[PDB]
Design a binder for this molecule. Structure first.
Ligand SMILES: *[C@@H]1O[C@H](CO)[C@@H](O[C@@H]2O[C@H](CO)[C@@H](O[C@@H]3O[C@H](CO[C@H]4O[C@H](CO)[C@@H](O)[C@H](O)[C@@H]4O)[C@@H](O)[C@H](O[C@H]4O[C@H](CO)[C@@H](O)[C@H](O)[C@@H]4O)[C@@H]3O)[C@H](O)[C@H]2NC(C)=O)[C@H](O)[C@H]1NC(C)=O
Ligand SMILES: *[C@@H]1O[C@H](CO)[C@@H](O[C@@H]2O[C@H](CO)[C@@H](O[C@@H]3O[C@H](CO[C@H]4O[C@H](CO)[C@@H](O)[C@H](O)[C@@H]4O)[C@@H](O)[C@H](O[C@H]4O[C@H](CO)[C@@H](O)[C@H](O)[C@@H]4O)[C@@H]3O)[C@H](O)[C@H]2NC(C)=O)[C@H](O)[C@H]1NC(C)=O
Ligand SMILES: *[C@@H]1O[C@H](CO)[C@@H](O[C@@H]2O[C@H](CO)[C@@H](O[C@@H]3O[C@H](CO[C@H]4O[C@H](CO)[C@@H](O)[C@H](O)[C@@H]4O)[C@@H](O)[C@H](O[C@H]4O[C@H](CO)[C@@H](O)[C@H](O)[C@@H]4O)[C@@H]3O)[C@H](O)[C@H]2NC(C)=O)[C@H](O)[C@H]1NC(C)=O
Lengths: 333, 77
């Protein structure tokens, strides 16, 4: 038990006379607090609430001369309960709506006092960070969601942030597979935000999410375009069969309304028109225009040539709808 | 499957009765919208078709093709 007893003496010496109230090297240069993150998972990107749920291993290494030890050659990994007895950066996520450290089996924290003094503090944090989502072109949209990391109290003179390993600081984002979002790219930034009090240190980890159109192309656009195609068929039915033609148009319009109401789920109420909203409106007003075209045809009937007007109406509708569709897609794609 | 079979029976009915064919086809198309919406609510919005939306979409195309064929025969009269 000589080795373990000696290690106990060393740890007792380190925690002896250790003032948690003072940052490392108080009355001295800013302490460089490196950060590295391992994104365990990103899930439940709540467009309705404009936020995403992030689960990550949040390591943050910094130098500290007080905790330096030399007797033991190995890297002590003390119990996670010693974190409360040690100074840590007062880091806080600025755009965090609610966050918590995972509970079982014990509070998921890590402490690892290296011989030099470096401390590898780490946490397994789940945070529902919020990113203002610009859904103007949704679903054919991208989102620049981020996790602003900042020191609440200390200023740049007292603490400095930086990604440890630089572009290699953040890991595991590639493996993530969100259900409807492809993480096209992630970018790491270092800033010194100038507030009223002073220049605070800042880090920003932004994932440029991109919407997966496969589900939206499956359920949103395809049924709508099919229903719209049905409306043109009423032009083939001819005018003498008034009842069948008007029945067809009536079914089409009510189908469009049902589509709109059922698709409204899981959508916020941003004022501007969404791309899905624009396309649904376009198809719906086009179907209504088809019904109005039938009305015009019947009114002309009451007032040979009606068949010729029907002939022109035949070709115009697919062509004009195709032009409108191409305009929509090229504008948005 | 039952709706698809109903779409086929629309062929069996007649060709001279335009309104009946029209009504049958349009209502047949209407049903599949609710059917498709109901299935997707439980699942997460995974981009790839989960092989259930695949079957639903194939049936949707089948009934829509029944409408297309109905219109094609209607033209000749
Ligand atoms: C306690 O924990 C620490 C931290 O891990 C251990 O010490 C470090 O262990 C890492 C292993 O992950 C070592 O990383 C290697 O460092 C080599 C030299 O680095 C020197 O230079 C850098 C500046 O660039 C200093 O920051 C660093 O301190 C060193 O002074 C690199 O050359 C290595 O890269 C090479 O890796 C492999 C194998 O060599 C090659 O095949 C690659 O091609 C590449 O060239 C690697 O990065 C690090 O050097 C260790 N020392 C430190 C951090 O000071 C302790 O060992 C551990 N205590 C124990 C186990 O008792
Ligand atoms: C926001 O997040 C911070 C994160 O730190 C929370 O702060 C911690 O809160 C917990 C719980 O409130 C604190 O844990 C408490 O520590 C007390 C002091 O422990 C020292 O002193 C005792 C002797 O008195 C030593 O034995 C011990 O080793 C330490 O040296 C304990 O006295 C407390 O005990 C109470 O809770 C236990 C729970 O098991 C009961 O069984 C006891 O009977 C007693 O009621 C408790 O363990 C922790 O110390 C805080 N951190 C720091 C750094 O102090 C905030 O609470 C949190 N706030 C909100 C609003 O979420
Ligand atoms: C998602 O949204 C976030 C918002 O946080 C964006 O992050 C911003 O990105 C922009 C550009 O990527 C940052 O703007 C500037 O980037 C420079 C990149 O450095 C390279 O390019 C410059 C020239 O542009 C070269 O000189 C340099 O050598 C590098 O090759 C930084 O260098 C800039 O900082 C410098 O300029 C500012 C202003 O002049 C000074 O105050 C600094 O001290 C420094 O001298 C600057 O950062 C911007 O900073 C990022 N953060 C923001 C806006 O908060 C993401 O880009 C966006 N996209 C993704 C995918 O995440």
């Amino acid at each position: 038990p000589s080795n373990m007893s000696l290690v106990k003496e060393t740890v007792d010496r380190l925690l002896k006379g250790y003032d948690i109230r003072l940052r490392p090297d108080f009355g001295g240069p800013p302490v460089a607090v490196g950060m590295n993150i391992d994104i365990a998972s990103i899930d439940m990107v709540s467009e309705v609430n404009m936020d995403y749920t992030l689960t990550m291993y949040f390591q943050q290494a910094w130098r500290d001369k007080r905790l330096s030890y030399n007797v033991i050659p190995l890297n002590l990994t003390l119990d996670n309960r010693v974190a409360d007895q040690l100074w840590v950066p007062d880091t806080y996520f600025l755009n965090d709506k609610k966050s918590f450290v995972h509970g079982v089996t014990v509070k998921n924290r890590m402490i690892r006092l290296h011989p030099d003094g470096t401390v590898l503090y780490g946490l397994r944090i789940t945070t529902t960070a919020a990113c203002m989502m610009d859904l103007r072109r949704y679903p054919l949209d991208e989102q620049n969601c981020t996790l602003e990391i900042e020191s609440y109290g200390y200023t740049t003179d007292d603490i400095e942030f930086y990604w440890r390993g630089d572009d290699n600081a953040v890991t595991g984002v590639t493996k993530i597979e969100l259900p409807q979002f492809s993480i096209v790219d992630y970018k790491l930034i270092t800033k010194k935000v100038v507030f009223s009090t002073g220049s605070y240190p800042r880090l920003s980890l932004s994932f440029k999410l991109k919407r997966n159109i496969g589900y939206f192309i499956l359920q949103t656009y395809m049924p709508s375009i099919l229903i719209t195609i049905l409306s043109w068929v009423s032009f083939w039915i001819n005018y003498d069969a008034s009842a069948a033609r008007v029945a067809l148009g009536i079914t089409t319009v009510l189908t469009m309304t049902t589509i709109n109401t059922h698709l409204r789920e899981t959508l916020p109420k941003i004022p501007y028109v969404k791309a899905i909203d624009m396309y649904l409106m376009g198809c719906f007003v086009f179907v209504f225009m088809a019904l109005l075209e039938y009305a015009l045809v019947n009114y002309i009937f009451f007032g040979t040539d009606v068949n010729a007007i029907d002939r022109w109406s035949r070709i115009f509708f697919p062509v004009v709808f195709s032009f409108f569709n191409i305009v929509y897609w090229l504008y948005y794609v | 499957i039952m709706t698809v079979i109903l779409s086929q029976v629309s062929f069996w009915l007649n060709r001279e009765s335009v309104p009946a064919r029209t009504v049958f086809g349009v209502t047949t198309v209407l049903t599949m919208t609710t059917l498709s919406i109901s299935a997707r609510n439980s699942l997460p919005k995974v981009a790839y078709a989960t092989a259930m939306d695949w079957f639903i979409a194939v049936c949707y195309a089948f009934v829509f093709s029944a409408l297309i064929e109905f219109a094609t025969v209607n033209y000749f009269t």
